[PDB]
Point group: C5
Chain length 256, copies 5
Amino acid sequence: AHKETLDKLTNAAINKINLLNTSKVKYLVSSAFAGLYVGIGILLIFTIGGLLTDAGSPMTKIVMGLSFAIALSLVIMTGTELFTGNNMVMSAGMLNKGVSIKDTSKIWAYSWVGNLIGALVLGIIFVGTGLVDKGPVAEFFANTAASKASMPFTALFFRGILCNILVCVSVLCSFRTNSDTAKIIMIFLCLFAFITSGFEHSVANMTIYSVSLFSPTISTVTIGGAIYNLVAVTLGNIVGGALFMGLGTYILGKEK
Amino acid sequence: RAHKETLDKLTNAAINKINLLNTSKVKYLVSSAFAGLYVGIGILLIFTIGGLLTDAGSPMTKIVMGLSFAIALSLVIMTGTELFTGNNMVMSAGMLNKGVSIKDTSKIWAYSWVGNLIGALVLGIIFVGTGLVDKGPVAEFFANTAASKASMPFTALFFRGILCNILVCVSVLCSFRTNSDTAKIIMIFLCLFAFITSGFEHSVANMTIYSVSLFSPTISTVTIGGAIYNLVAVTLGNIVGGALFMGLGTYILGKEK
Amino acid sequence: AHKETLDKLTNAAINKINLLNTSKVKYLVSSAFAGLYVGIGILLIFTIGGLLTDAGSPMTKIVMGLSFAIALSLVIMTGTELFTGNNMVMSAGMLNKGVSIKDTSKIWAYSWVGNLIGALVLGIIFVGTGLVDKGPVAEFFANTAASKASMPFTALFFRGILCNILVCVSVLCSFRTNSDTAKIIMIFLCLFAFITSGFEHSVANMTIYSVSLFSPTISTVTIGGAIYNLVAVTLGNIVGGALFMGLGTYILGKEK
Amino acid sequence: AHKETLDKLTNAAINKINLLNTSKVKYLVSSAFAGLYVGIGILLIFTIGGLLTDAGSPMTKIVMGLSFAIALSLVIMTGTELFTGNNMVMSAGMLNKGVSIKDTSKIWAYSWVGNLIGALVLGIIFVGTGLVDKGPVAEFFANTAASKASMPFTALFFRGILCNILVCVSVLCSFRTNSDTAKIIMIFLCLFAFITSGFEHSVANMTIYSVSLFSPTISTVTIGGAIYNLVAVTLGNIVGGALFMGLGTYILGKEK
Amino acid sequence: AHKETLDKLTNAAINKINLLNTSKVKYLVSSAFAGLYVGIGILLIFTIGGLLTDAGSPMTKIVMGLSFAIALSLVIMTGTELFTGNNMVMSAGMLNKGVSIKDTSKIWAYSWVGNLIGALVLGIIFVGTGLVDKGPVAEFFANTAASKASMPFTALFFRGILCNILVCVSVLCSFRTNSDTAKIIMIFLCLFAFITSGFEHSVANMTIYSVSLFSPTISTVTIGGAIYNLVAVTLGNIVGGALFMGLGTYILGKEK
Ligand SMILES: CCCCCCCCO[C@@H]1O[C@H](CO)[C@@H](O)[C@H](O)[C@H]1O
Ligand SMILES: CCCCCCCCO[C@@H]1O[C@H](CO)[C@@H](O)[C@H](O)[C@H]1O
Ligand SMILES: CCCCCCCCO[C@@H]1O[C@H](CO)[C@@H](O)[C@H](O)[C@H]1O
Ligand SMILES: [Zn+2]
Ligand SMILES: [Zn+2]
Ligand SMILES: [Zn+2]
Ligand SMILES: [Zn+2]
Ligand SMILES: [Zn+2]
């Protein structure tokens, strides 16, 4: 049912841009929450990364992956604005003559900046719990944040592609089912996949660098490196979202 | 995107609460009691696990603990009973939405809080009578955890409670946005897995923690003035996460003019 | 929604006493099965107890509790007469003016005996499988039946209270959801909670003592010690089922 | 509600026999598929039993049980003819005046033989894969076949009884719910129990022996010993299925 | 309920060829995603194999099977064209007189070549991430591709069969249920069964070899060996898929 799906997608895009043109406050607040949601998932899996790494476990990355489902499940189940997901919706709705190229440009920028705000808000709050004053978890953040800002642009860009392919395909999946359960399971599988395989998610990283740059202990990485990671991964996501999933669902769901 | 339809569902839920309180206090407390005892049953389970595993020196203890805490909020959702931390978002949202007053909110918060506590007290007492926390790893787990929580800076507890309710209320929010019960349970399971393992603080869960520690004859790491210090700051944290975050969010996203 | 549920419970209660006043065969044959169904859960988690204990792992209690779900899941899905569950139904239905004190006591007695007959039959058959001729499993039974029969009264009594709160609250959930899957998930969590936490269920114990008594491989049993545990635990279940859940569901769901 | 189920069963029995009298091809082809489907489950959990026993694991049997769900999940979800299941269905239908005693015997004889053809075909093909040319799995196969063909008749008979009580009770559940998801979860719990507990399924054993015999590695099997196990368990199965489940479902769901 | 299913199947077949006859771009792009989706499943379970292998674990093969569901799940939920699935559909469709032999061979050819386009695309992108420049994963990819290539034709062939009997029987299931969750669960089981059992999947192998050839690590892969495996496995699938499931779902479902 590609036609029915492409239509759903396009409506989604129109609804998004409509919200933005109606209330920037509403759209920013909705995106803020999606960032805090994806971020919560990060906090869970780095807390797991810490516990399991300190204990020298081979299962660390598998378990970290199995436990990330909450990040996207919360976003999908609350109907909040996540930038990575708008990479497919805006483009798919754009090729379908439902939204302009500006519309897409505007939703991407606002959803992005909006997601960042949720991540910064979460960062400060977590930091204030003490839970990263020192120890295995605190360190797991510092090291990870360093690893990522230290990788080749090509490596990130491509990691970013494979990631948003998985994310958007689970979003597409939710558009093609009525089972909120099936929705969640598919999100579970895709995040399990993208997390454990080592792909890069622009928004989830906002929480990673948010907590680092806001933590006292963490001296390891600069703000300039956080921008290099987000930009290289962002571009990667955009490609994997718009140029693969966006264009793909349109091609499969046109009618002449 | 179905925010108006939901903010409505919320604003209605808020009304039914203050309505229930106003027609029968026996009914509102007895409900709040079963909720506290339900959230507490969840603490009995994961603290038993917390004990078996720490005594064995496993690195998976906090992970397995968070995973098993699902029963706490699941019972409360599936029975439709009054939980204080859940009303932080409902009453809050229903208030901003011109459905209930500030007086109603603080009435429901108080009666459900004091109500949940009765649930904990009854549970703890009964749990002690089972003899399961006379001695051993579990007793030691309650004893040690009770002390760690009572001896943390105010700010730490405060923020730990904020992140907790954002998760607890959001799982509730999810339940107002789906007709699948299975979907409801899963999301609760995920949100609880997150807040437990991440090390966040839930006031009504702590009532069973302190209920059991203080009531146990052999567990003295406690201090009632300590349990109060915790329950107050964590509760403050929960209200800020439930009302100022989720409550205010569900409304800002739900209005129309 | 408590009016509908309380009404719903009262109807269940009235059906039970109707079935018993209509056919004692049907009601004992339905109780025997519910006993033998819960008993099956025991045979599983004790076979699991023998293997994990003999090997001495910490997870033993946790795995056992996660595996007991089948016990009450068969009872609910087959729709058969479990004594512990009748503590809430008959209790609430009675308070709601639908059933009489005499009706409650009959349904309580007849399902108890019936459940027991259920376990006796399971025991004999299990004994004949040889699965308990000697080794970890038969040892886990022997060892477990001892401690249960050597615990102070109040301990069992309270343990029985907490058990039937969980067992009945899962039964309650199966009255508040149209999703059969959601039913099974809730039973799962409740049975996981009460098993791993070390609470006492009377019907399940009939199977424990059924095997320990029929198996040649002795025990620190002595029947008299089995009647002591079954009597003290049953009273606990009754209090937890009737006084807590039964009366609780009534108070929340009356109308004036 | 039991006549509404007892009715479903009686209709299921009438349709089974209607199929046999309409196409001995269709009924066999269906039974051979059920047999092969169940065997497929065996191939998985013996591949597991081989991996885990070799490494000396205390979890071996527990993981085996947890993974055997696929066996009956294909037979129920595809609607194919399984002998063990026909014990309760044909039995209950025969007691409810739906089908005759000769009807019950044809269905039983054919489905049984049909299931064997499935196992044989699967057995052959599996051997051709080379996965039993030598090693842990092959050893687990030949080892388990022996132990089974070496146990007293009684043991097998009683194991067969408890095995079918469980396999049939899950088949009953699938008659008592409209949730396909629920149907599966229940099959999962029932097989988990009977596998891990130590009970004997006659059709699953066909594949166990199919492989052991057709397998290039000597044996220690003796085909005359394989028949001993299949007769012992099959009879155990019949009792468990017919006398217990069949008779119980009829008794609980009559109308006078 | 096979008539209705055979009808449903014959319809899928008619739609597939219709799609191909109406737009080669739509069809190939649809097959490109199916291959890439199945490939993502491989990327996941080889990342898992690399980690657990390097840590020397006996559970590795078991954890790989449990984590492969995302492969056929993404495909069934996006409604995309996977060659191994068309072995059954086109077979049953043909025998039921909905499509021709020419129609069949076109669908087979185009999906297979379409799936390969997807493998090659996933390959390039994945290697571009550095996640296989060197290490346990990279070495795992290399090592598995070598084993597969260096295996007798008869072995690969028979494993291709059993693999597709499961891949297809899961597609058959998705045709028989309306529970989307039940569809995923059943796929999860079937992919668990064939991965852990050690069976051979043509399309999954496409990404294995796609990554082993673009990958920097030197090994014993040999292109002539990749074609030898792809061919001998492809065949195996065609047989188990068409000669087994196709013909079976036809025989059980025709009407006279
Ligand atoms: C906290 C306030 C956030 C405001 C974010 C607005 C940033 C807009 O950014 C611009 O928006 C244009 C359309 O308006 C697009 O055409 C441009 O591509 C984009 O850069
Ligand atoms: C047995 C439990 C009794 C609980 C009684 C709680 C009564 C709360 O009463 C409320 O208190 C608020 C302050 O918290 C005030 O702002 C409100 O005006 C007042 O109505
Ligand atoms: C073969 C098994 C037969 C069991 C029949 C049990 C009959 C129980 O009968 C009931 O016993 C109660 C107390 O036990 C009494 O309070 C009731 O008055 C009485 O009807
Ligand atoms: Zn349209
Ligand atoms: Zn309104
Ligand atoms: Zn009424
Ligand atoms: Zn009739
Ligand atoms: Zn037709």
